[PDB]
């Protein structure tokens, strides 16, 4: 069992509404971790205990190269600590902003990593529910590291559960079924994937407005358009993901899963095996 005194803490890497992430070096091993720290009093006062429990429970189930790893948790009288892998290159969103628009090669590569990650997650019966570029981190080698699992859901295999009832997510990426039927499913993450692919190419996600209610109205009407020069096979893929009926999205269980998605023409040149060992294309 680790303790706070086992680490030397360095810079703050980020702050959330009820957490702070600090770079730390473990004294006994010299390894670096990103340690997420939460104050018990604050999470108790603000009804956040279930989110903290959920993040721990979901992350404990994951062991795949495209996810942030939870190595340990511990606590003291005041705080909870999550020891996470350190994603040195930060958020995918930073790069979309820096460059403006990804080229086709880079769009394909990063989309493929996200698809591979979702295949793994959905195979474990887990819905992310808040997939977006801020929650897709990058490691030192520029491979993805998906994070933010406190609003994820483990579907019960015992009841063959397909739908989850908590209202969570981010407006730009929220699925129409969550807005209208008040539940999400694995296919809700495929909707978010479509939004992300669009954003990589177009520079902004497809449903845009200055407030949430306006975004919701656009989502439920499928009110969006493509900019000029949007890579034609990517456009076709986005149109097969941004579908109002969640049972008709390419990659969903009712469309027979990830095989048909990975076979889409946009991915023709992708080698799906060992993507995490391939050198990513330079972002330029």
């Amino acid at each position: 069992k680790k303790r706070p005194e086992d680490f030397k803490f360095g810079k703050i890497l980020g702050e959330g509404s009820f957490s702070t992430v600090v770079l730390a070096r473990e004294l006994a091993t010299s390894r670096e971790y990103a340690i997420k720290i939460l104050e018990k009093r604050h999470i108790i006062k603000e009804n956040k205990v279930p989110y903290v429990t959920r993040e721990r429970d979901v992350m404990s189930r994951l062991d795949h190269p495209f996810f942030v790893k939870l190595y340990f948790t511990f606590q003291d009288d005041e705080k909870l600590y999550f020891g996470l892998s350190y994603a040195k290159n930060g958020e995918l969103l930073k790069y979309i902003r820096k460059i403006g628009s990804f080229d086709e090669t880079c769009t394909r590569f990063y989309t493929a990593e996200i698809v591979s990650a979702l295949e793994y997650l959905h195979g474990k019966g887990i819905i992310h529910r808040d997939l977006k570029p801020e929650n897709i981190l990058l490691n030192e080698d520029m491979h993805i590291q998906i994070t933010d699992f406190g609003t994820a859901k483990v579907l019960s295999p015992e009841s063959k559960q397909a739908r989850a009832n908590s209202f969570v997510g981010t407006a730009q990426y929220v699925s129409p079924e969550l807005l209208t039927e008040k539940s999400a499913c694995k296919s809700s993450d495929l909707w978010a994937l479509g939004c992300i692919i669009y954003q990589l190419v177009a520079g902004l996600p497809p449903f845009r407005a200055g407030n949430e209610g306006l975004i919701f109205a656009k989502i439920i009407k499928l009110e969006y358009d493509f900019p000029e020069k949007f890579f034609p096979k990517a456009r076709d893929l986005v149109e097969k993901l941004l579908v109002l009926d969640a049972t008709k999205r390419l990659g969903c269980e009712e469309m027979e899963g990830y095989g048909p998605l990975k076979a889409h023409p946009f991915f023709e040149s992708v080698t799906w095996e060992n993507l995490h060992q391939q050198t990513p294309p330079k972002l330029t």
Binding site: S60, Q75, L80
Partner: peptide, 9 residues
Amino acid sequence: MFRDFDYIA
């Protein structure tokens, strides 16, 4: 609470 929080991979 937090009795079931501690964890080691």
